[PDB]
UniProtKB/Swiss-Prot annotation, chain A:
Species whose genome carries this gene: Severe acute respiratory syndrome coronavirus 2 (2019-nCoV)
Subunit structure: Binds to host ACE2. RBD also interacts with the N-linked glycan on 'Asn-90' of ACE2. Cleavage of S generates a polybasic C-terminal sequence on S1 that binds to host Neuropilin-1 (NRP1) and Neuropilin-2 (NRP2) receptors. Interacts with host integrin alpha-5/beta-1 (ITGA5:ITGB1) and with ACE2 in complex with integrin alpha-5/beta-1 (ITGA5:ITGB1). May interact via cytoplasmic c-terminus with M protein. May interact (via N-terminus) with host bilirubin and biliverdin, thereby preventing antibody binding to the SARS-CoV-2 spike NTD via an allosteric mechanism.
Protein name listed in UniProt: Spike protein S1
Full-sequence portion shown in this chain: 563 to 612 of 1273
Effect of residue 8 to D: In strain: Alpha/B.1.1.7
Glycosylation-annotated residues: 41
Function: Attaches the virion to the cell membrane by interacting with host receptor, initiating the infection. The major receptor is host ACE2. When S2/S2' has been cleaved, binding to the receptor triggers direct fusion at the cell membrane. When S2/S2' has not been cleaved, binding to the receptor results in internalization of the virus by endocytosis using host TFRC and GRM2 and leading to fusion of the virion membrane with the host endosomal membrane. Alternatively, may use NRP1/NRP2 and integrin as entry receptors.
Curated annotation (Swiss-Prot), chain B:
Species of origin: Severe acute respiratory syndrome coronavirus 2 (2019-nCoV)
Role of this protein: Precursor of the fusion protein processed in the biosynthesis of the S protein and the formation of virus particle. Mediates fusion of the virion and cellular membranes by functioning as a class I viral fusion protein. Contains two viral fusion peptides that are unmasked after cleavage. The S2/S2' cleavage occurs during virus entry at the cell membrane by host TMPRSS2 or during endocytosis by host CSTL.
Residues listed as glycosylation sites in the UniProt record: 6
Protein name per the record: Spike protein S2
Source organism phylogeny: Viruses, Riboviria, Orthornavirae, Pisuviricota, Pisoniviricetes
Disulphide bonds in the chain: 27-49, 32-38
Amino acid sequence: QQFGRDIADTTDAVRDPQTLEILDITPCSFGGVSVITPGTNTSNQVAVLY
Amino acid sequence: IAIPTNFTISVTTEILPVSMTKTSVDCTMYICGDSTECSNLLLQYGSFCT
């Protein structure tokens, strides 16, 4: 077995042809950021939730 | 007429849902993965992701 895929058929892990090791592939785009703000009217401070 | 001479105390269970699972979808990551030009094409569709 040369590579693996998830339910969506997205390629989740591959095998290096030379070393023959198993490497998982994870998207390089974190989109789970939330910003807590008391309002620009009252302050410019924020907190960040990952 | 018919009158009751005794009583029973019945405990009965009623089951009611109150909440779902809070789910979120990163529209861009779902549609285009991490492809830059797919994302550029997706901008042409406006505010659907928002």
